[PDB]
């Protein structure tokens, strides 16, 4: 991993030692080249996972998440340029450094071999995330959004820290490979049931689980666009990735311990998807859509089947690209009229025909049109849950209906109908903006062509 991490660290001096007129062109270009180098992790010609050293590894679960992380950094930079163009030069460089910091921290997080190392990097990400939300968010509610985000995470993370220390005191190590091979059955004591919850809650809050999700709609509505991109695409996946790594040592208590969280997720995914039908704020709508999708990820990880893990891995990647695309699409209208109210701008297909095409594909991805990886992940999750209990299809069926309703509702409301023609400041789409949309959507199509790369650990 050092041949990926070291060049990423060199982006920081590159940012600060570049001329003001070359900073964006420089950092974006090398960020693309670093994404290219991360593809080396996909050269996997056997079934032994790559252990580069005692500290860094990569297997079929972390490899897609590392590459998606590397790809997001250039995309976030392009997304940020227009709304930062009034900041002075030092403030622009500070913002870029925050974005690089997350890229470095997240790549290290997904390749860490030891759980307290994962925990430290997992917690470190809050610092640049909070700074981005609160220093560059637009509204007065960005400060409250920062508090919710930081402290929903932290209250769950403290029990996680206790559990990790406890496991290490008992086993002698937090190395993941050794924990895997030497794992032994747990007794079903009250003490072990609290251990299960301490190991799971921080990851479940991060997903977020329905019930403790209020931080996420707040954080998205208030964050700048690059903050929304990283939060929806990668940061939520830390919880799902954490749950998959740590659940190997929690057997057999997950068989009964999972029931309340399957119930919250399967019912909760209907509550949050139905909220999207009556949401007046476009960013909030996309955010609630994420909570509904991540509810599926929670359910499939909880039932721990080969299909359920594979469907969760695909959905994690597919949602990452799709939701980041939707935030970028919404931000392009906001940068023109400076409102997130969905019903304000209307008939936009009349004036932005190619941007409306990007809107349609993002919406078709979101409602899981086959053969997209969006549908493939949701399909295999549905099959595994049906096996777990045939009555799950009732709640799946309701969510599928509602997801089509709000996905097409967003398109009809904003792109169709009569143009709101008092909006004479609807400047034509930027080349940068149209390029940004394509950089989301080409990988989604390419991954649909070769879905072996995101199947995860079980297939």
């Amino acid at each position: 991993m050092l041949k990926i991490i070291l060049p990423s660290l060199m982006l920081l001096p590159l940012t600060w030692l570049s001329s003001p007129k070359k900073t964006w062109t420089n950092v974006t270009s090398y960020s693309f080249l670093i994404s290219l180098t991360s593809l080396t992790l996909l050269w996997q010609t056997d079934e032994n996972y790559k252990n580069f050293s005692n500290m860094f590894s990569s297997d079929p679960l972390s490899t897609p998440l590392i590459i998606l992380t590397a790809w997001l950094l250039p995309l976030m930079l392009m997304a940020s340029q227009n709304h930062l163009k009034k900041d002075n030069n030092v403030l622009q460089k500070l913002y870029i450094s925050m974005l690089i910091s997350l890229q470095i921290l997240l790549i290290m997080t997904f390749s860490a071999t030891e759980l307290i190392m994962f925990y430290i990097l997992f917690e470190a990400t809050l610092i640049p995330t909070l700074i981005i939300i609160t220093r560059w968010g637009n509204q007065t509610e960005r400060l409250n959004a920062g508090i919710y985000f930081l402290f929903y995470t932290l209250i769950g993370s403290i029990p996680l820290l206790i559990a990790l220390i406890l496991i290490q005191n008992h086993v002698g190590t937090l190395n993941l490979m050794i924990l895997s091979f030497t794992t032994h059955t747990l007794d079903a004591s009250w003490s072990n049931n609290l251990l299960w919850l301490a190991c799971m809650m921080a990851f479940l809050i991060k997903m977020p689980l329905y019930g403790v999700h209020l931080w996420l709609p707040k954080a998205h509505v208030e964050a700048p666009i690059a903050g929304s991109m990283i939060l929806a695409a990668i940061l939520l996946k830390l919880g799902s990735y954490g749950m998959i790594r740590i659940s190997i040592i929690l057997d057999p208590l997950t068989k009964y311990m999972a029931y309340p969280f399957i119930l919250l997720s399967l019912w909760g995914m209907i509550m949050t998807s139905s909220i999207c039908l009556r949401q007046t704020d476009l960013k909030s709508l996309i955010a609630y859509s994420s909570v509904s999708h991540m509810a599926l990820v929670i359910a499939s990880i909880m039932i721990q089947t080969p299909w359920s893990f594979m469907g969760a891995t695909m959905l994690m990647i597919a949602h990452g690209l799709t939701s980041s695309l939707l935030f970028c699409l919404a931000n392009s209208n906001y940068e023109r009229i400076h409102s997130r109210t969905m019903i304000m701008a209307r008939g936009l297909q009349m004036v932005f025909p190619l941007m409306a095409t990007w809107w349609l594909m993002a919406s078709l991805a979101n409602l899981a049109l086959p053969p997209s990886i969006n549908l493939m992940g949701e399909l295999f999750i549905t099959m595994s849950l049906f096996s777990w209990s045939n009555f799950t299809i009732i709640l799946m069926g309701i969510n599928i209906i509602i997801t089509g309703m709000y996905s097409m509702y967003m398109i009809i409301t904003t792109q169709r109908g009569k143009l709101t023609n008092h909006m004479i400041n609807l400047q034509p789409s930027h080349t940068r903006e149209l390029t940004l949309m394509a950089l989301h959507m080409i990988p989604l199509i390419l991954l649909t062509t070769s879905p072996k790369l995101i199947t995860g650990l079980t297939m």
Binding site: S53, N54, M55, T113, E114, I116, M117, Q168, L174
Partner: protein, 57 residues
């Protein structure tokens, strides 16, 4: 024939001869507890370094 001792003479420490044996354990003390065994050998580096969580060295 008694000569009075001079100033300083009576305060001297003197040696006296006695057939009485020297007491061997006048305090009636017990045997002292044995010291802790000492660990010997040369120093080697700590095996695998500090071993502090995930630090390699």
């Amino acid at each position: 024939g008694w000569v009075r001792p001079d100033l300083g003479q009576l305060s001297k420490v003197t040696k006296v001869k006695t057939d009485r044996p020297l007491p061997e354990n006048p305090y009636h003390s017990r045997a002292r507890p044995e010291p802790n065994p000492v660990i010997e050998g040369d120093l080697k580096p700590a095996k695998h370094g500090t071993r502090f969580f995930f630090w390699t060295v």
